[PDB]
């Protein structure tokens, strides 16, 4: 006698092998298409007419160099639907126009929403706190700023990161040469977050494993544990005294330690996301003007910053001709900045 919502809710939230839930209605369709779009694009779809490159296994690329490349810059920020004014219903021409990138980017962005809603959905059902969903906001902020916000501030989707291994590497090296992204204080906070989180993961895992209580007679200490055991498996007091005498400071609160393990990585990605938002507008921390004034006036003042500035000039000049074919940059070799010999 239950209504549609109740009868459907019963089926969606059934405790099966792979939980579906209400958010699965949004996650699984979009996530499958984003996965399928990437695998299809890296296997058969070319980037010959968008970037002048081969980016599929069928064209001869391998896992490292295959990618689902962005549309041509002339497309601007066109959403590039299968039915849009570009590639009007023609599937094969849609693939040749780079429309598969916006397909993966859009259905992929809604999959991230669906997965984060899934974390809320399951946590409410299991009756626990929603801190895993809050932790997942950081990867979403990275995806939203890097794959959506940054190209939207630039000329078009062409400058978004293409979905591939080497394509991401080109995107990375583009940011050094054109944005000096290493010098940005927001990637610096992002690096500290990621490196700090990797440190915490390793240091906490090792500390627990080396302060374990003897709860068995076997050398294999993995078996001497029960998920329902009330006693702690490792000595926090020994762990605390160890790091107090080795490092000078140690965690004394188990709850604080695990929250810190969550705060460092999330805060890092969020800070890094702010910096990429700034690069979307070319609002970059490219240079220190005081040193540039000093260097120009004094031809003997050199720092590692000025050396990097010259490296960026080399990256921009030797990469623009092929990385930006829409600009039609024909640079004669004499005009390219080149050092002695080499």
């Amino acid at each position: 006698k239950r209504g549609w919502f109740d009868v459907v809710d019963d089926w969606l939230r059934r405790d099966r092998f792979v939980f579906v839930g209400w958010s699965g209605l949004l996650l699984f369709p979009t996530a499958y298409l984003a996965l399928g779009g990437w695998f299809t694009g890296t296997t058969f779809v070319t980037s010959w007419y968008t970037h002048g490159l081969a980016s599929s296994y069928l064209e001869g690329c391998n896992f490292l160099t295959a990618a689902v490349s962005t549309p041509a810059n002339s497309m601007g920020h066109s959403l590039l639907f299968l039915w849009g004014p570009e590639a009007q219903g023609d599937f094969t021409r849609w693939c040749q126009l780079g429309g598969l990138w916006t397909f993966v980017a859009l259905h992929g962005s809604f999959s991230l929403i669906g997965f984060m809603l899934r974390q809320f959905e399951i946590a409410r059902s299991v009756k626990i706190r929603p801190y895993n969903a809050i932790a997942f906001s950081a990867p979403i902020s990275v995806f939203v700023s890097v794959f959506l916000i940054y190209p939207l501030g630039q000329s078009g989707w062409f400058f978004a990161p293409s979905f591939g291994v080497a394509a991401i590497f080109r995107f990375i090296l583009f940011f050094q040469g054109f944005h000096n992204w290493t010098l940005n204080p927001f990637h610096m906070m992002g690096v500290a977050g990621v490196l700090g989180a990797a440190l915490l993961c390793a240091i906490h895992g090792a500390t627990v494993e080396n302060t374990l209580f003897e709860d068995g007679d076997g050398a294999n200490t993995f078996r001497a544990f029960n998920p329902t055991q009330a006693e702690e498996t490792y000595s926090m007091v020994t762990a605390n005294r160890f790091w107090s005498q080795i490092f000078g400071v140690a965690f004394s609160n188990k709850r604080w330690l695990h929250f810190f393990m969550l705060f460092v990585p999330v805060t890092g990605l969020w800070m890094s996301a702010i910096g990429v938002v700034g690069l979307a507008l070319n609002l970059r921390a490219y240079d220190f003007v005081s040193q540039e004034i000093r260097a120009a006036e004094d031809p003997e003042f050199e720092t590692f910053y000025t050396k990097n500035i010259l490296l960026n000039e080399g990256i921009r000049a030797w990469m623009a001709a092929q990385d930006q074919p829409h600009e039609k940059l024909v640079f004669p070799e004499e005009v390219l900045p080149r050092g002695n010999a080499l």
Partner: protein, 81 residues
Amino acid sequence: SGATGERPFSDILTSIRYWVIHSITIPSLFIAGWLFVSTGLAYDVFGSPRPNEYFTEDRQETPLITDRFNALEQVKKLSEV
């Protein structure tokens, strides 16, 4: 612990029926993938150039899409063999 009502994978992957059924289904999907490429259908469906189709007598350089609302017409001319 417990189980969610599905048959244990170990049971299915050890049963004779599964291998009798998947000794044809999995091989057939592989062969279909092989024929999808060998018959040239992969090139035609997704439009990737054949190894002898990247350049033409008219165009000896990389293509460039320089139009948005006429991109469908333009990419046909660039892809013309």
